Amino acid sequence: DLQNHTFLHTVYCQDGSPSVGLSEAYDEDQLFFFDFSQNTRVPRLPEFADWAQEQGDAPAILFDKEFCEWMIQQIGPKLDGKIPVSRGFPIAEVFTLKPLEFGKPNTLVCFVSNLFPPMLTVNWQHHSVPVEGFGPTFVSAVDGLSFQAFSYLDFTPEPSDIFSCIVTHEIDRYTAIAYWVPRNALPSL
Amino acid sequence: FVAHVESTCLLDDAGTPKDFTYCISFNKDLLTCWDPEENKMAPSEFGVLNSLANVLSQHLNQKDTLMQRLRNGLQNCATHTQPFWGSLTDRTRPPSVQVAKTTPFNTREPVMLACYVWGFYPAEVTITWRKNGKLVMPHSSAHKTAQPNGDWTYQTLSHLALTPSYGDTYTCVVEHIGAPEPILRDWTPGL
C-alpha cells in the first residue's frame, strides 16, 4: 500500500576518459556522484548535502572501484576484437526550464539521453556563435546500464533568438545537434 | 569497453528494504548478480559469453569480506540511507501553473490553450480541465510523464481545444502532492 522508491549506487569504468566514476541516484534524480581524486562524494543540488560526504563507507566503494578497474584492465584486451563494443548515439533536446515570456530571464536546458559510453563534451551556441554556459555538465547513471546528462544556459529570450546545443560523443568525436527557437510565447503582462 | 557494479536499493516511503540486488555487467551485458535464496554469486540468466560470468562467480565467492555484505544485504540499505532518507520521502515542491493560448495542432478548433505546469517534485501530477464549472476531456489522451529538469524539479503541460465564446470560463486543475489544495487557473475569451 506504500509506494516504492529506488536508490541506485552505480559503479562504472571504461577505457578512456574518465576511467572511473560512481553515480548514485534516488528516483532517477541523482543526489551524489563520486570523486576519486579527492575520495569524497560531491553533491548535486539536494541543498548540497548537509550530511554530504560522510566517510561511513569507503570499504564498499573502494572495493567496487578496484574490481571494476580490473575488468577493464585484465578482461579488456582478452576480449578486444572478439566481441563487438556496445555503443549508442546520444540524443540531445533543448527546452526552457520555465515558460517562455519575452524579455524575461530564463534558462535553456540541454537534455542528453542515450549516452553510452559516458564520454562527452557539450557546447552552447547562440546564433551559431560559441557561448559559455552556466555550470558544468552533469552526467548521471540511469536504469538499464545507460547514462544521461544535463547542461544549462542562462539567457534573456528575444523573439529572434536562435540557440543550439551541441553534443560531442568523446569515443569518436561524433556530434549530435539540437536547435532552439522561441515558440508560443506567453503574453507579457 | 564499459563495466558496471550496480547496487539497487528498494525501500518503501517509510524506510524499509523490500529488495536489494548486486549485479555485475561488462559491455552492457548483464553478467553476474546476487541470489538471496541460494546465498551465492550466481551468473544472471544464461549467456553466450557467460563463461566469463561463471569465472566471475569464482573470483568473488572467494571473498567472505564481500560474501558477508551480501548476506547483510537488505538492512545495509537502511543503515546507508537513514540520514537523508526521511527528507527525500519528505522532499516536495509545489508546481507553478499558468495558462495562455498556444498554436493549435491536430484540430478543427480555432483556439488552443496550454496549461503549463513547472518546477515541482515529485513528478506524479494530474492535470484536468473544466468549462463553466463542469469537467471536460483534454486534447491528447496519450499520458505524458513529466520531463525531468535534472535539478530535482519537473515540468509538463496539457492542451485544450475550443471554439471561443466570451460567456464561457475554462479552468485548468492541477493536483500535485505538493499542495493539499487543487490549484485552479481561469481563462476567458476576453482576457
Ligand SMILES: *[C@@H]1O[C@H](CO)[C@@H](O)[C@H](O)[C@H]1NC(C)=O
Ligand atoms: C513494493 O515493492 C515490493 C518489492 O520490493 C513489492 O513486492 C510490492 O508489491 C510493492 N508494493 C506495491 C503496492 O506495489
